[PDB]
Design a protein around this ligand. Structure first.
Ligand code: SIA
Lengths: 581, 583, 587
C-alpha cells in the first residue's frame, strides 16, 4: 500500500491486541448462568507462547527476530517467565453467558519501501496476553458465525504503526564510594518492558499477574569500568548501602486488577519495572567511575479509556533507546565502606581519654563513646589528617555498657575531615553515645609508629563543634598565603589555627587580611590562651568572600578562625592569610 | 421400606450434598472478627478422595464400584485432577463469627427389591466438594449442640433417587475432508461430568475452582474407522482447521463464583464440558468416515435457589448415555487439505495469462493473483474438471509484490468445481489479490501432458463469476436431454455451455425447454457471439424459474448459449438440468 | 535507661511490625494509575525467613534462640510452612500511586538488668509478614526522602515490652472412656501461635494466607500417663469418636481479608488455632487418666484499630503458659468403646425374645455385645437373676447406611451414647429401654468374679413396665426387717431416671402393712411409686404416689407386707455424683 516514507527497510510495531484467523475457540469456553461469575484465565509460558513468523525473500526469520528484538521487546528473554492473566464475567440474573478465551499477540512487520509503496512485508506475531469474548444467549438463539469464527486477523484494540528505519551543581561529597537510589518505576522506551495489554469490556474484570512461578528476574547493568565496578562488585555495594540481598531472583508477587464500569471499555498496559541505583567513585569533586544497576521491581500499570478498534493509525517514529521513570522522583545518597580498606575496632567505649596505636594502606577504626560529648580526635603531631563517619542507623540493636557492639553496618555518613593526608589537622565533633563511628586513616608514607588520640573536650574547644581544624605552620614574615581544602557544605564548618609570625612580646602586631576566594562564609575568630586551650572571641560575623577588612594581631600569638560556609560556589574553599606590618 | 419397582437389584444415586455423622469439625474452622472476611477451602485429590464403602452379602465392594461407575460419574478417573472449592464469609462490625468446614459426598446405593420391599442395601459415599456452616456469637454464648454435631447422615440439599436396574439432511459439500465445530458446553448425561455442588448460605459466597494443579485433560473420542481416522489423524485435522494445539493438556484455568443474597441460600452445580468437533470424509453425497472429538473445555455452572432439604423425592430412571449441549448453537464447517494429496505452487503471482505445466494422483496448486479480477481457469480441452478453494484467512500477513507468499494454511473454503470424471468444464471465479487459492486437479487416468490455463477476463465472461461451466456436446436435433451434476449450495451457481443443434444461418431456430428436476433455481440465459479475444454474451432471458418449468424459447440453430443457474432450494445433493428440443 | 525491674536476665518481646534501617525499598514497588488496583504480596519461607541475630558476650545466638522459643512463638518450626500475605490498593481516578514492599519483624531482646539499669541487650529480628506504604504522586514530582528511607529501626505499630525473667463440677458419666470436644479457636498464650500482623493503610486492603504449599501441621499433646494414653492411642480414640483421620497434615486452606475504611488504619493479627479434645478415663466419679489433644485448626483473625506507634509502652509480665479460647463455647461428650474389651455380636435382629448364653471363668473380663432389634419398642434386658448389672449404649449414627432385613449390619461405630445401667459389682438390676429398629446397641457386661454359666435375656414389653422407659431398676433384696436402710448408686443426669424394685418384709395377706420412709440425701428428684400386681391377666403397675419430692422427705407411707413396689426417680438437682436412696421401715 501507499506510505509517506523514504525508500528503505523499516521495523514496525503495529501494536498489541491482535487475534488470529480461525483460532478463536481452541482453548474452550465457559457457560455461566443466573447472576453467577465465571473467571477464565491462563499463563503464557514456554510451550504455549510460540511466535509465528511470515517471512519474505528479503527478510528471513533471523533478520526479523534480530531487528525486532533490537528495537522492541526482547520476547526470547521474556518467554521463560510465566505471566498470568484472567478475565471475570458475571451473567445476568435470568440469562446464560458464554465466554471464550483467545491468545492475543503483538504484530510486528518488516517492510521494504520503494517510491512510497510497500513492495514487501514480513510479519511476526509475538505472544502477549489474551482476550475473552462473551455473548448472552437463550435456548434456540441463532448466533452469528462471526461471534465464534474470525476469517481475517485483526487488532481488538486500536492498531499502531510505530517504525524505525533499519540501517546497513557542586557536590561537596568527601572522596569515596557512593550508592544512590535514583527511584522506582523505570521502564525502557518503545515497550521493551511491556508485559502485555488487556482489553477489559464494560462491567467485566481483567488481571495481569506475576505469580513468581519462576523466581528469575533480569537486572540491567552498565559500568564505566568492568575492572573496578563489575556487576558482582556493584551488587556487594548495593548490599552494603541498602542490604539488597536478592539481585536476580524474587519471591515478591505483583498483579494489576481492573474492573471496567458499565458503559466503559478499558485498556490496561502492564510493564516490568526497575529501581535505578548508581554506584559512583567520587574524588575531588568529580565522578571517576560509575555503574548503573537497574534492580527488577514490581511493575507499572497504565490505564486508558479503550479507543475505537477502527480509528485511523498515525505513523510514528520510535523513541531513542533509554529509560522513562514512571515512579516518583527520588535521590538517596549513601556512602559505603571501601571494601579495599580494612576495618579495625576499639572494643572499649571511649570515656574522657583514649589512645589507639597504629603499627600502610588506608583503613577504618570502628568505635563508640560512653557519653554524648564533643571530642577532639587527632593523630600524633596532627598528621595525617583524618576523616570520621557515622555508621547509619547504628546503635539501635545490641548494647553492652562500656563496650562496642559491632551491628555490622557499612553504610556511612561523612561528618568531617579532609582528604589532605599531609595537612596538619584535628577533628572536633559531637559524638552521640548511642551510635557507632568510623575513623578513616589515609595512606601514610612512613615506617614509624603513629597514634590516634581521643579526648573528651569540656572547654572552649567545644565551640569548634563539627569542624576539622587546619594547623597552619608556614606563615612567613609578610606577603600573601593561601590554603586550599575541600569545602564543607552549606551550614558545615572548617577551622584554621595559626601563629602570627615574630616573637611574642604581647606588644608587636601585624595586620592580617582573612578572606576566601570563591565561597561565602561567616568567620568567628578566637585568641588562644593555652590554659587545654581557652578561646577568647575577638571578631564575630566576619564575611569572608573577597573581604578587604583588616585586623591587627599579636606577633607570635595563636588564633583559630572558624568558617561556616554560606555559599557553596566551588568544590574547594581557599582561605587567604595576607600579613603586613 | 416400600418401593414401587419390579423385583431385582438396582443401582441408585441419592444425590450430592450428603454430610456424615459425627465428622462435622474434623477439618477445623475459622474464627473471624469485626469486619474481616474469612475464606476457607480445600482441594479434592488422592488421599482425601477416598470413598467409604458399606457392603452387604449380595453386594461387595467390587460389585458396588463397578455398577456405580458404569452408570454414574467415574470417581476413580476424576480423583487424579485436583478440583478446588472455597467459601467466603464476612464478620459484621463488632461481632465474632465461627465458620467450620465439612466434606460433602454423593450417596450411592445398591438395593435388592422383592415384592415391593427393599430387603437389602449397600452404600457408597464418594467425596464431592464441601460445605461451610457459620454462626455469629458473643463471649459465653450457649450454642446448640446440633450446630456442631450431626448424629445421623443427611443430605444438605434435596435428595435424589435416580436408579437403574442391574442386569444378571442434504450436505452440498464437495468431495473431501471437513472438520466441523458443533459448539461448546457439552456434557454427558447422568452427571458423568458433574464436578460438584455447593450449598451457599445466605450472605456468603462460594466457588468451584479448576486451578490446573495438574494439566491433564481427558478428551472423548469415537471413530467409524480407526484405520483412517485415528485419534492422532483426527487431532492433526483439528490443527489444520482451527490450529488446535493442545488435546489432552491445558493451562487454561476456570472457576465459578456465586454470592448468595441476604434472603436465600443458593445451590451452584459445576460441570466439566467439551467442545464437539466432527470430522467427516465426504464422497459423492455420503459420509464414508466420521470421528467425533470432544475437546475438554472450560465448564458449565448452573445456579438454583436452594431446594428444601425436605422436599418430595421422586424416583426417576436414569437417562440414556449421550451428551447435552449447554453452550450456544454453533456449526462451523471448515474444509481441510487432504494430507494424502501433494501440494505444488505457482511462485509468481498471476496477472493476465499463465500456463501451468502439470508435473497421475490428485494434487493441489497453490497460487495468488496480482490484482483482484475475474479468472477463467481450465485444463486442456476442459479435461479434467478442476476445483478451486480459498485458503481461509490467507493474505493478511507476508506479502511480496508479484509473488506468492505461502502462509501455510490448510483450512479451505470450497468455491466451485465438480468432482466428475470425464465431464468437461471451466471455472470462472472472482479472485482477490490479497488471498491465496488452491486449485485441485483430480485423479487422471491418462499419461499424456496436460496444462492448466489461467486467463484474466476483462469482458462478458465476468457475468458467470463464481461458477463452473459444464461443456455440453452434441445435442440431438429433437427430443429429451439431461445432465446430472453436483448441486451448488443455495445462492451458489452452476453454468452450462451448449450448442443448439443444426447449421447456423442466423435464422433457423429450434424450441428449447430448460428445466431442473429436484432443486429450484434461477436461470440467466446468454447467447454467445464469439470474438478472437474471447466470448461476448447477450443476456436474452433472466429469472427463468427452473424446477419442472414448462416454459420454452426459440434459440438459434448452431449458436452457442450459456445458462447460469443460481440454486434457490436445495432438495437433492444433485442437480439435473434438462434440455428438451422441439420444432 | 532506668527500668523498674528486679535484677536478672529477661527475654522481652517488643512486638510485631518492626521495619529495618535502610532496607525499605529493596524488594521493589508498584506504580498504578487511574482506576486500577495493585496487589503486592510475598511468601515467608526459608531464604526470606532468616532471622537477624545481634548477640552479646553473655547472650549468644543459641541462647537467644532457645530462650525466645521457650516463651514466645517457635519461629524455627514455623519457618518450614509458607505463610502468604498480600496488600491491595486502588489508585483513584486520574491519579498515580506508588506502593513499595518491606518485610516486617518481631523484635525480641535478651536483657541484663542490674540496679534498675539495662546493662546488656541482645536483639533478634524474626521475619513476620510485610508492610506496603503508598503515596500519591504526579509524574516528575519529588517525594520526601523519609517516605523512601528509614534511618533507624522502628515499629510501625505500637511497640510493646512483654518480659519473663529467665531462670537456669459434677460429671454424671458412666465409668469408661470419653473424648470431649471442648471447642475450636484455641491459641496458646504469649502469641506463641501468632502467624503475623499487618498494618493496613486507610483505604487499602491486607490479607494473610495459609495456602498449604506444605501440608504439615503440628498438633499439641499432653498426657497424664503415656503408658495408658499415648499420642497414638489418643489419636485412635479421636478416630473412634469423630472419625478424625488427619492429625499432622491438612489440605484445608484458610485466609483472612481485611479492608480498612477511608478514615482509619487497621491492624489484623492472624493466629493458628486448635480444636481442644480431652480424652478421659472416668471411674467412680473421678478422672483417673486424662490426655489433652490440640488438633490443628483453621485460624483466628483479630481486627483492631491501628494503635498509634507513639503510644505509651507499658512493661508487662507475660501470661503463664496455657491456652485462650477465641471460638464459641462448645462441649461435645462422646463415649468410646474401650479397645481392651472384646466385642461379641448377635447377628440376627432380635424380635420379641432372645437369650444369649454367657460362659463363666473364675475371673471374667468385661465385654460388649453388639445387637439390633426388628421392631421399635420397649425392651426389658437383664442377666440371670438380674446379676450382674448391665449397661446399654447406642452406637452413634448406626443404622443409616448398609442394611439387610432381619440381620445386624456392623457399620463399625465405636462412638457410643450411654443410655442406662450401673457400674455396681454388688447391685442386682434389669434395664428397661426404648430401642429403635434402625440402630445398633451395645450391651456391656462388667467383670464378674463369678464363674457360673449366665445368660442375657432380652424381652419386648407391651405392659406397664413401659412407665419405666429409660431406667435401670435396682432389685433391692435385703429388706429383711424393720430398720434404717440406704443404697448408694451413680446418679442419673438431670431429667434421667433410676428405679428401685423392693419387697416389703413380712408375710403377704393383703392386710398387713409396715411404715415406709423413702427419701434421698444429696440430689433432689421426683418419685413415682407403683404397686406391682401379678394377676391372671398378667402384671400391672398401680400408681399410688406421684410428684413425691424426695430430698430429705419426711413423708412416710404404709405399704403391704410381702408385696412388691417400684419407685421411679427423676433426678432434678444434680448436687452429687451419687444418688443415695433411703428405705426406713418401722411398724
Ligand atoms: C445393706 C443396706 O441396706 N444398704 C447398703 C447398700 C446395699 O447393700 C447395696 O447398695 C445394695 O446394692 O450398700 C451401700 O454401700 C450403699 O449402697 O451405700 C451401703 C448401704 O448400707
Amino acid at each position: 500500500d501507499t506510505i509517506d516514507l523514504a525508500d528503505g527497510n523499516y521495523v514496525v510495531s503495529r501494536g498489541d491486541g491482535w487475534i488470529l484467523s480461525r483460532q478463536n475457540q481452541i482453548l474452550g469456553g465457559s457457560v455461566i448462568s443466573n447472576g453467577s461469575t465465571g473467571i477464565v484465565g491462563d499463563l503464557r509460558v514456554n510451550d504455549n507462547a510460540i511466535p509465528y513468523y511470515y517471512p519474505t525473500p528479503s527478510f528471513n526469520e533471523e533478520y526479523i527476530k534480530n531487528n525486532i528484538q533490537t528495537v522492541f521487546a526482547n520476547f526470547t528473554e521474556a518467554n521463560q517467565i510465566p505471566i498470568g492473566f484472567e478475565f471475570s464475567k458475571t451473567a445476568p440474573s435470568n440469562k446464560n453467558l458464554y465466554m471464550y478465551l483467545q491468545y492475543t499477540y503483538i504484530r510486528y512487520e518488516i517492510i521494504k519501501v520503494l517510491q512510497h509503496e510497500i513492495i514487501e512485508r514480513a510479519v511476526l506475531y509475538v505472544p502477549s496476553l489474551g482476550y475473552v469474548k462473551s455473548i448472552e444467549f437463550n435456548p434456540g438463539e441463532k448466533i452469528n458465525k462471526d461471534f465464534y469464527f474470525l476469517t481475517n486477523d485483526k487488532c481488538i484494540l486500536n492498531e499502531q504503526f510505530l517504525y524505525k528505519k533499519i540501517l546497513e551543581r557542586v557536590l561537596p561529597y568527601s572522596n569515596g564510594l557512593y550508592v544512590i537510589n535514583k527511584g522506582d518505576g523505570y521502564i525502557r522506551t518503545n515497550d521493551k518492558d511491556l508485559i502485555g495489554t488487556l482489553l477489559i469490556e464494560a462491567g467485566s474484570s481483567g488481571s495481569i499477574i506475576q505469580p513468581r512461578l519462576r523466581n528469575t528476574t533480569r537486572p540491567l547493568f552498565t559500568t564505566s569500568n568492568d575492572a573496578k565496578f563489575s556487576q558482582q562488585y556493584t551488587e556487594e555495594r548495593l548490599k552494603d548501602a541498602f542490604n539488597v540481598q536478592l539481585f536476580n531472583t524474587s519471591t515478591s508477587l505483583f498483579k494489576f486488577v481492573e474492573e471496567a464500569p458499565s458503559n466503559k471499555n478499558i485498556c490496561i498496559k502492564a510493564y516490568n519495572t526497575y529501581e535505578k541505583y548508581e554506584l559512583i567513585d567520587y574524588q575531588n569533586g568529580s565522578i571517576v567511575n560509575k555503574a548503573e544497576y537497574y534492580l527488577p521491581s514490581l511493575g507499572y500499570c497504565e490505564v486508558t479509556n479503550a479507543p475505537s478498534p477502527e480509528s485511523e493509525v498515525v505513523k510514528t517514529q520510535v523513541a531513542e533507546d533509554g529509560f522513562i521513570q514512571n515512579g516518583p522522583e527520588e535521590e538517596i545518597v549513601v556512602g559505603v565502606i571501601d571494601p579495599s580498606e580494612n576495618i579495625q575496632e576499639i572494643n572499649t567505649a571511649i570515656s574522657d581519654n583514649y589512645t589507639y596505636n597504629i603499627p600502610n594502606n588506608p583503613f577504618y577504626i570502628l568505635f563508640t563513646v560512653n557519653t554524648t560529648g564533643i571530642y577532639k580526635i587527632n593523630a600524633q603531631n596532627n598528621l595525617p589528617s583524618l576523616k570520621i563517619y557515622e555508621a547509619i542507623g547504628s546503635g539501635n540493636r545490641n548494647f553492652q555498657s562500656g563496650n562496642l557492639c559491632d551491628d555490622d553496618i557499612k553504610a556511612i555518613n561523612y561528618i568531617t575531615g579532609f582528604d589532605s593526608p599531609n595537612a596538619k589537622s584535628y577533628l572536633v565533633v559531637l559524638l552521640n553515645k548511642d551510635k557507632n563511628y568510623y575513623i578513616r586513616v589515609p595512606q601514610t608514607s612512613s615506617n614509624i609508629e603513629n597514634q590516634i588520640k581521643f579526648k573528651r573536650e569540656e572547654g572552649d574547644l567545644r565551640n569548634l563543634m563539627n569542624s576539622s581544624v587546619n594547623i597552619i605552620d608556614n606563615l612567613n614574615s609578610t606577603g600573601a598565603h593561601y590554603y586550599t581544602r575541600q569545602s564543607p557544605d552549606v551550614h558545615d564548618y572548617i577551622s584554621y589555627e595559626f601563629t602570627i609570625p615574630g616573637n611574642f612580646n604581647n606588644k608587636d602586631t601585624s595586620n592580617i587580611r582573612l578572606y576566601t576566594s570563591y565561597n561565602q562564609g561567616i568567620g568567628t575568630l578566637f585568641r588562644v590562651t593555652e590554659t587545654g586551650y581557652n578561646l577568647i572571641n575577638i571578631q564575630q560575623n566576619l564575611n569572608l568572600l573577597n573581604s578587604t577588612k583588616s585586623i591587627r594581631l599579636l606577633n607570635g600569638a595563636i588564633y583559630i578562625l572558624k568558617v561556616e560556609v554560606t555559599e557553596l560556589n566551588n568544590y574547594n574553599i581557599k582561605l587567604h592569610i595576607d600579613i603586613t606590618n
